[PDB]
RNA sequence: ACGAGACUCUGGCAUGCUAACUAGUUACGCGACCGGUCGGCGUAACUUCUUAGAGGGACAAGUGGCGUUCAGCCACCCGAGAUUGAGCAAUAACAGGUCUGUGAUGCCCUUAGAUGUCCGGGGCUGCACGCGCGCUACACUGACUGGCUCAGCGUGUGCCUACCCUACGCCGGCAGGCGCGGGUAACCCGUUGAACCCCAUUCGUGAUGGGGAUCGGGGAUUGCAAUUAUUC
């Protein structure tokens, strides 16, 4: 087979970015089944870029030190809630995933300029990689806080967080804090 | 606030207080007759595309 | 903080469960325990009873992660 | 009996290997069934210690290291030939022994 | 083309072994089941009330895998990290009394026999019974 | 981080200035001739010297070299 | 099926009101002797339905629990498992769980207080007598 | 009949002996798809799902795995299997079949034919971890 | 010229070579399964995984571009490796520390009302707060029944060196016991059956079962003595 997890279709992926697809793309022969191939992607600049999105996003689950390096839990926790998402939504655990991340990544940030600038900042464009990495962390942080002292468990916060991100709702922590940072930047333009 | 794409043609340099911005020249697709200078935040590449929220704004050059 | 949940059969536990609980599209022990505010022990007992009846479909089983889908 | 072993224990690899090659060549010269140089796993003793005499300054630990090596060679021969081939002007600093089965 | 002793899920294979043994009911239990702590890392009392059957089945499986597992091998199979609270924990061997009682309970019941190298091994009749169990449980869902 | 020390550069210059005829353009032959006609007490040093010798041969073909 | 009679949310063991919202074998931990592995042992030797809920527990089962826990001689459980092994005053090895006397047994320092031992003096000052360093640490409990 | 090509991952290793037989594969004297974690079963199963079962229906491969660490024990089984097939085909049958299988796997995954260069770095003194040092007093 | 680099040690490659019956493929009742998994055996091929020796191998070497077309840098083919990690580490100095290592010590204090091994009898295990190097913790990211399949470095039974790591049978919850005990070594520990997890009762959203951090009581092995239970 060539499908993700043997159930997720590989052929109905959409461009959906025209020319930003080069950094969010799962359509090649390297798109493997189980997102677990050790940590050889963080060894050189943009050798992470050729990695498929599913792999990096399941990698970004292990935070807080208590669950550091528990990639088995991460792949199980992604397989669960993937077998859920499409189910509750209906599309393709993939297409929904790319749409959710694209909707959860900021596009404009604020940076200080000059040798001694200490009063004002300036608006700057955000590169694909930076926003995607940040968005994945936001999604993971939202899942963690929906699983922290809350009635919801792991491998389930991710599903509804991704559904909200695809929907564009303010329920998800990701896009709501994206909007907060965007408002800060807009006041800082 | 329209959003448009422009192709990177020459990565001019790296600036910023501690250094976080890449100043780069981008040529628009739909015109190809006008190019601008933008400081993109985050790891950027050569020949890729960048999403700008404002086309009338340019960062400091040199 | 504190969450007082009933730990015995009562009027609310059995009612709106034969249809309205599988009437949703997403059913899990977390989902049922949240949309009914009952302990997961009796919820899992009812789920096992219904599975022995064979009207809901299991996707995953665990002591902390069980997945159900409508089969009626 | 035809069950004779010889044991060469040392610290340097060059002198021990030259001695082993000399012994194997000499035992090959006479028509002997000799087992080749068996290399026992070298053992290195690690000693991380204080550098300063009195505790003062930075915690710099001297990792003194001694590696020792052992070779065992079996051969089926008259023991008189074993004695006559042992005294072949062996290298200083190598300990050579003869073991019976 | 024959049947493999380990072609089944070892978890479900050992569960089938426990079910077969408790259907047989031959293996006895000692009088006390509440005195022994049963694990230097344990925090409470075991919640099975039948852990002797599972222990015997698992130990017979282990003796099938390899022999010589005498008094000194079993205690370190389940022995492990022992929480000392604030102190960094350390490895502690399993309780020797209950392990020795298990060794005496498995002995003398026509499944475990003495071997030249010490410890004990599995009598071939028990191996044939386990192979029959494995074949049946394979035909249950793996051969249909 | 692949700048050549003056030992390698000077040895390559001397070898090229004395033994132009023997050496060629393939590193695996320059290393052999260099180890033949020189006392190089290390394999790594010989590899570095031969690599810079091959680079110097690629330099001379396009024109005379200053050094 | 389920029991509609006798249903009480309180299991009175020592004229006390314990929380019934907790499941069995864990809610009874509140007693000064019953709890942790002690409760597990007494309910395991009680031979009752440990898989049932606390609400479905009947009066007869709590009565059986009281009978088994009153007599450590009911099932020949050795004395060392108990906390009052090798008792003071008189050699005592049975079990009696009751309020108003258990704290006096806890007040076993007064006997050694009367012997003015080093342990007695250390107990007088409220310090950790097991050799714990109290040089300047220990700021909790003094405001 | 036997190539014994082995395969490495961390300090752990796996040896896949390949012979002419029924085509069935055994690992640790056991069938293939019942490994207890059941999480990375397809990770080691990749060769079959990539090259097809027919390429795996003419060689009997017995794989033995030894080395500390359970995740280190896995990730060498599939590399050993691929290397065993490559060596067996090159030694016995012809070049073209092994060429196609190696080309397909490499275009899929490069790691299936070459070992991992990564290994655990030593720990230098003055700190709790490998690179990390003790907390300074300021 | 010194320092840097080179260099020494270490690892990423050796189906090329010298090779062992301590570790081991491939090898037929013996121990068995309706042609197949099973550390109980022995010679055979003589080394692939196993150990360590000679070597060899990587050189910004081969392409694309940038570069005062230089020194170099950035990507790709190939390759095990396209920056493995340490050791050593220069001028000249600090009134830095060490006279509590010195039987290396100078000069004052010494020269018995001593400034030592002798009872160890005697103490930093004494407390009204803060700075200074970590672990448990905050859980439905996991405590939790066990089903489990697997390590690396190495000290290890004594020309005054008594102190050694661990299997058979039994006892006991625990410290241990007795007969030979396996250890001149990869033969013995041990196919080091260690940490998480693939599951098995509770918790199903917590002050509790985790936090046992503070007070009761039971035992052993080197201890003339373990009180201020230091030790399990």
Swiss-Prot record, chain C:
One MF term in the entry's GO annotations: RNA binding
Quaternary data: Component of the small ribosomal subunit.
Name of the protein in question: Small ribosomal subunit protein eS25
Organism: Homo sapiens (Human)
Lineage per the UniProt record: Eukaryota, Metazoa, Chordata, Craniata, Vertebrata
GO BP of this protein: cytoplasmic translation; ribosomal small subunit biogenesis; rRNA processing; translation
Name of the gene encoding the protein in the UniProt record: RPS25
Modified residues (N6-acetyllysine): 2, 11, 19, 25, 53
Entry keyword set: Acetylation, Cytoplasm, Ribonucleoprotein, Ribosomal protein
UniProt modified residues of type N6-succinyllysine: 11, 53
Similarity comment text for this entry: Belongs to the eukaryotic ribosomal protein eS25 family.
Subcellular location: Cytoplasm
Role this protein plays: Component of the small ribosomal subunit. The ribosome is a large ribonucleoprotein complex responsible for the synthesis of proteins in the cell.
Record keyword Acetylation present: yes
Cellular component terms per the entry's GO annotation: cytoplasm; cytosol; cytosolic ribosome; cytosolic small ribosomal subunit; extracellular exosome; nucleolus; nucleoplasm; nucleus
From Swiss-Prot, chain E:
Result of altering residue 100 to H: In DBA1; increased protein degradation; affects assembly into a functional ribosomal subunit
Residues recorded as bearing N6-succinyllysine in the entry: 142
Coarse class of the protein's main subcellular location: cytoplasm
SUPFAM superfamilies assigned to the protein according to its UniProt record, in alphabetical order: Winged helix' DNA-binding domain
Effect of residue 126 to E: In DBA1; affects protein stability; does not localize to the nucleolus; affects assembly into a functional ribosomal subunit
GO CC terms: cytoplasm; cytosol; cytosolic ribosome; cytosolic small ribosomal subunit; extracellular exosome; focal adhesion; membrane; nucleolus
Disease: Diamond-Blackfan anemia 1: A form of Diamond-Blackfan anemia, a congenital non-regenerative hypoplastic anemia that usually presents early in infancy. Diamond-Blackfan anemia is characterized by a moderate to severe macrocytic anemia, erythroblastopenia, and an increased risk of developing leukemia. 30 to 40% of Diamond-Blackfan anemia patients present with short stature and congenital anomalies, the most frequent being craniofacial (Pierre-Robin syndrome and cleft palate), thumb and urogenital anomalies.
Protein name according to UniProt: Small ribosomal subunit protein eS19
Source organism per UniProt: Homo sapiens (Human)
Taxonomic lineage: Eukaryota, Metazoa, Chordata, Craniata, Vertebrata
Swiss-Prot record, chain F:
Family: Belongs to the eukaryotic ribosomal protein eS17 family.
Gene: RPS17
Modified residues (N6-succinyllysine): 18
Origin species: Homo sapiens (Human)
Name of the featured protein: Small ribosomal subunit protein eS17
Assembly and interaction partners: Component of the small ribosomal subunit. Part of the small subunit (SSU) processome, composed of more than 70 proteins and the RNA chaperone small nucleolar RNA (snoRNA) U3.
Disease per UniProt entry: Diamond-Blackfan anemia 4: A form of Diamond-Blackfan anemia, a congenital non-regenerative hypoplastic anemia that usually presents early in infancy. Diamond-Blackfan anemia is characterized by a moderate to severe macrocytic anemia, erythroblastopenia, and an increased risk of developing leukemia. 30 to 40% of Diamond-Blackfan anemia patients present with short stature and congenital anomalies, the most frequent being craniofacial (Pierre-Robin syndrome and cleft palate), thumb and urogenital anomalies.
Subcellular location, record wording: Cytoplasm; Nucleus, Nucleolus
Curated annotation (Swiss-Prot), chain H:
Compartments (UniProt record): Cytoplasm; Nucleus, Nucleolus
UniProt-listed PROSITE patterns: RIBOSOMAL_S9
GO cellular component terms, A-Z: cytoplasm; cytosol; cytosolic ribosome; cytosolic small ribosomal subunit; extracellular exosome; focal adhesion; membrane; nucleolus
Pfam families referenced in this protein's UniProt entry, alphabetically: Ribosomal_S9
Entry's transmembrane regions: none
Family indicated by similarity: Belongs to the universal ribosomal protein uS9 family.
Keywords: Acetylation, Cytoplasm, Nucleus, Phosphoprotein, Ribonucleoprotein, Ribosomal protein
Protein origin, superkingdom: Eukaryota
Gene: RPS16
Function according to Swiss-Prot or TrEMBL: Component of the small ribosomal subunit. The ribosome is a large ribonucleoprotein complex responsible for the synthesis of proteins in the cell. Part of the small subunit (SSU) processome, first precursor of the small eukaryotic ribosomal subunit. During the assembly of the SSU processome in the nucleolus, many ribosome biogenesis factors, an RNA chaperone and ribosomal proteins associate with the nascent pre-rRNA and work in concert to generate RNA folding, modifications, rearrangements and cleavage as well as targeted degradation of pre-ribosomal RNA by the RNA exosome.
Organism: Homo sapiens (Human)
Name of the protein in its database record: Small ribosomal subunit protein uS9
Single GO term (MF): RNA binding
GO biological process: cellular response to leukemia inhibitory factor; cytoplasmic translation; maturation of SSU-rRNA from tricistronic rRNA transcript (SSU-rRNA, 5.8S rRNA, LSU-rRNA); ribosomal small subunit biogenesis; rRNA processing; translation
Keyword check for Acetylation: yes
Main location: cytoplasm
UniProt key word Zinc-finger: no
Residues that bear N6-acetyllysine: 53
């Amino acid at each position: 087979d060539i499908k993700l997890f043997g159930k997720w279709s590989t052929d109905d992926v959409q461009i959906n970015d025209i020319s930003l697809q080069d950094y969010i793309a799962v359509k090649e022969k390297y798109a493997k089944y189980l997102p677990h191939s050790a940590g050889r992607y963080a060894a050189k600049r943009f050798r992470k870029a050729q990695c498929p999105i599913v792999e990096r996003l399941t990698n970004s689950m292990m935070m807080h030190g208590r669950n550091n390096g528990k990639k088995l839990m991460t792949v199980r926790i992604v397989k669960h809630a993937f077998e859920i998402i499409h189910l509750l939504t209906g599309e393709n655990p993939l297409q929904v995933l790319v749409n959710a991340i694209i909707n959860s990544g900021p596009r404009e940030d604020s940076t200080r300029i000059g040798r001694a600038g200490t009063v004002r900042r300036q608006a700057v464009d955000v590169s694909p990689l930076r926003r995607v990495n940040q968005a994945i962390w936001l999604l993971c942080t939202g899942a963690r806080e929906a699983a922290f002292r809350n009635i919801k468990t792991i491998a389930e916060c991710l599903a509804d967080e991704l559904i909200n991100a695809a929907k564009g709702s303010s329920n998800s922590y990701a896009i709501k804090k994206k909007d907060e940072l965007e408002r800060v930047a807009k006041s800082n333009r | 606030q329209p959003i448009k794409l422009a192709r990177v043609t020459k990565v001019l340099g790296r600036t910023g207080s501690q250094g976080q911005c890449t100043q780069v020249r981008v040529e628009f697709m739909d015109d190809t007759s006008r190019s601008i200078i933008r400081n993109v935040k985050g790891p950027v590449r050569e020949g890729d595309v960048l999403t700008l929220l404002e086309s009338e704004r340019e960062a400091r050059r040199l | 903080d504190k969450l007082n949940n009933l730990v015995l059969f009562d009027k609310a536990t059995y009612d709106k469960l034969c249809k309205e609980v599988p009437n949703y599209k997403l059913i899990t022990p977390a989902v049922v325990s949240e949309r009914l505010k009952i302990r997961g022990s009796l919820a899992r007992a009812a789920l096992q009873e219904l599975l022995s009846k064979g009207l809901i479909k299991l996707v995953s089983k665990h002591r902390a992660q069980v997945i159900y889908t409508r089969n009626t | 009996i035809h069950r004779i072993r010889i044991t060469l224990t040392s610290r340097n690899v060059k002198s021990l290997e030259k001695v082993c090659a000399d012994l194997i060549r000499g035992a090959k010269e006479k028509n002997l069934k000799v087992k080749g140089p068996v290399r026992m796993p070298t053992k290195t003793l690690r000693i991380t210690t204080r550098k300063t005499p009195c505790g003062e300054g930075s915690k710099t630990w001297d990792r003194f290291q001694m590696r020792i090596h052992k070779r065992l060679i079996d051969l089926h021969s008259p023991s008189e030939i074993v004695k006559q081939i042992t005294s072949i002007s062996i290298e200083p600093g190598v300990e050579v022994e003869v073991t019976i089965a | 083309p024959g049947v493999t002793v380990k072609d089944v899920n070892q978890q479900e294979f050992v569960r089938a072994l426990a079910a077969f043994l408790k259907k047989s009911g031959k293996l006895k239990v000692p009088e006390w089941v509440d005195t022994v702590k049963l694990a230097k890392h344990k925090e409470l009392a075991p919640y099975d009330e039948n852990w002797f059957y599972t222990r015997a089945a698992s130990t017979a499986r282990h003796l099938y895998l390899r022999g010589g597992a005498g008094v000194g091998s079993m205690t370190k199979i389940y022995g492990g990290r022992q929480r000392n609270g604030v102190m960094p924990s350390h490895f502690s061997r399993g309780s020797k009394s209950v392990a020795r009682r298990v060794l005496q309970a498995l002995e003398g019941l026509k499944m475990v026999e003495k071997d030249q190298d010490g410890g004990r091994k599995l009598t071939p009749q028990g191996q044939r019974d386990l192979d029959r169990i494995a074949g049946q449980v394979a035909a249950a869902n793996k051969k249909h | 981080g692949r700048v050549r020390t003056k030992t390698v550069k000077k040895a390559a210059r001397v070898i090229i200035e004395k033994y132009y005829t023997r050496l060629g353009n393939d590193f695996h032959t320059n290393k052999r001739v260099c180890e033949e006609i020189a006392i190089i007490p290390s394999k790594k040093l010989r590899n570095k010297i031969a690599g810079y010798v091959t680079h110097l041969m690629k330099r001379i073909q396009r024109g005379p070299v200053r050094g | 099926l389920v029991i509609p009679e006798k249903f009480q949310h309180i299991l009175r063991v020592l004229n006390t009101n314990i929380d019934g919202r907790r499941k069995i074998a864990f809610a009874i931990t509140a007693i000064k002797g019953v709890g942790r592995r002690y409760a597990h042992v007494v309910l395991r030797k009680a031979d009752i339905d440990l898989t049932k809920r606390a609400g479905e527990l009947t009066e007869d089962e709590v009565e059986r629990v009281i009978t088994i826990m009153q007599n450590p001689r009911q099932y020949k459980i050795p004395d060392w498992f108990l906390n009052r092994q090798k008792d003071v005053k008189d050699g005592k090895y049975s079990q009696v769980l009751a309020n108003g006397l258990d704290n006096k047994l806890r007040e076993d320092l007064e006997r050694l207080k009367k012997i003015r031992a080093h342990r007695g003096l250390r107990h007088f000052w409220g310090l950790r007598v097991r050799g714990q360093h109290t040089k300047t640490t220990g700021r909790r409990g003094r405001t | 009949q036997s190539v014994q090509v082995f395969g490495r991952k961390k300090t752990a290793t796996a040896v896949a002996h390949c012979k002419r037989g029924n085509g069935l594969i055994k690992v640790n004297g056991r069938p293939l798809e019942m490994i207890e974690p059941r999480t990375l079963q397809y990770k080691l199963l990749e060769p079959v799902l990539l090259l097809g079962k027919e390429r795996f229906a003419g060689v009997d491969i017995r794989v033995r795995v030894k080395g500390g660490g359970h995740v280190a024990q896995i990730y060498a089984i599939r590399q050993s299997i691929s290397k065993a097939l490559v060596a067996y085909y090159q030694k016995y049958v012809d070049e073209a079949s092994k060429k196609e299988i190696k080309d397909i796997l490499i275009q899929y995954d490069r790691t299936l034919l070459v070992a991992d260069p990564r290994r655990c770095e030593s720990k230098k003194f003055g700190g709790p971890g490998a690179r990390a040092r003790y907390q300074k007093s300021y």
